[PDB]
Amino acid sequence: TPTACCFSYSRKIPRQFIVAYFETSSLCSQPGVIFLTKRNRQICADSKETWVQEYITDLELN
Amino acid sequence: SSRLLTQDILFRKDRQATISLPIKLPVEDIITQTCDKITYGPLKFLDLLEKETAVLPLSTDITCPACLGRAVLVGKWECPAHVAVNESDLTVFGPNKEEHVPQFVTVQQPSDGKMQRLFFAKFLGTEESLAVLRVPGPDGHLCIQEALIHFKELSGAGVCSLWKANDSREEGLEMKQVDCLETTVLENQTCIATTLSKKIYHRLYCGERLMTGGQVSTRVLLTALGFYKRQPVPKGMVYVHLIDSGSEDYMEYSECEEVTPGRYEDKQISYTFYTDLFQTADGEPVLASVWGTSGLKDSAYESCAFVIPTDGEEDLVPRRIMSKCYPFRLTYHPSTMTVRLDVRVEKHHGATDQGFVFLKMESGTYSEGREYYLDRVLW
């Protein structure tokens, strides 16, 4: 897994923009999610939010 | 009053050549023989964790943030008489190892008789990787005259950046310590915010719809520095990339077509657009970088790079740096001032098939980036 930490989380964005995801490294004090977008850019989001878990469960369904 | 970073697109003689080891040339000759693009900026230090620390990006402008590359740090070492600093006191680290002493080498060129005492180190990481220099005491910074960084992208293009000490472009790189907020578990974590400001008329389109523009391209590096936990001699420092995503929104893509328009065929897609980047170059070379990924979790990054001379022998014809570009084809039509991009794709359309392509053409003063979204699979 790519080594990176979330310094601040991002606002929700439409599902049609997220293409992948992966949890943050164990070096990060706070567990965060890093979404990969159809623009091939990384976006940090708080895993403790519902829309994040919905994007995650829906991402693994595909 | 241009005190920002600047870049030149060089017309290297041997585009097949690369950084040869061991180091055998002076910094200047290395640039002249292996750099297709150079970025000039300042070399600044910051007293942290008991030593002056300088943070430099392996790639100033992130063409493909996730692409892997091979970087080389070559700095010039010379302490003034009144500075009793040993070569053994300089430490560096990057995306691969902990803080350590680099290897030094003396290079001589009887051509002009020049001689330099260099220190070097080799790295392999993404375009978002970093190189950190650390020198002791309050006077150590004076020993490092300048720091070159060569980065051979996936496309095979040489992207260099020279950071001289006391460079006139003092505002091209500003670094200021910030609070870490305990984001990382590193012991004694110290966060740094390095701001990179370049004077470049940059425009970013999605197909032919403008997304962003400006007279200066800024990039902010939020980096955490510290040490891994340990259990009961050496002080091996490392860094961790910090992603501050609260600042931006996805509004620019809110209006981009879900599938970027283009001419679809059996085995390729063709995109046409109008560009004045070759006319404003004013006889200067143009560095065209195209790369695409048809994958999500992961897929082969197809990258290519060309240098287009804008006048002289063989005028306005792409010259290849890589062996050859199979996935992508690029041609410029001066009469219409239009560019045509061709992408090899799989002849079968299907659902869930989403591809992404990015073409960045840039001169010394202008820069155009164009994002293409495909409903087919890239070769």
Ligand SMILES: *[C@@H]1O[C@H](CO)[C@@H](O)[C@H](O)[C@H]1NC(C)=O
């Ligand atoms: C530098 O190296 C010499 C031996 O090469 C050593 O004797 C001296 O103490 C060192 N000076 C400093 C400031 O580390």
Ligand SMILES: *[C@@H]1O[C@H](CO)[C@@H](O)[C@H](O)[C@H]1NC(C)=O
């Ligand atoms: C962190 O800061 C202070 C400096 O005295 C102390 O806790 C410790 O020495 C530092 N960490 C390490 C690994 O030395």
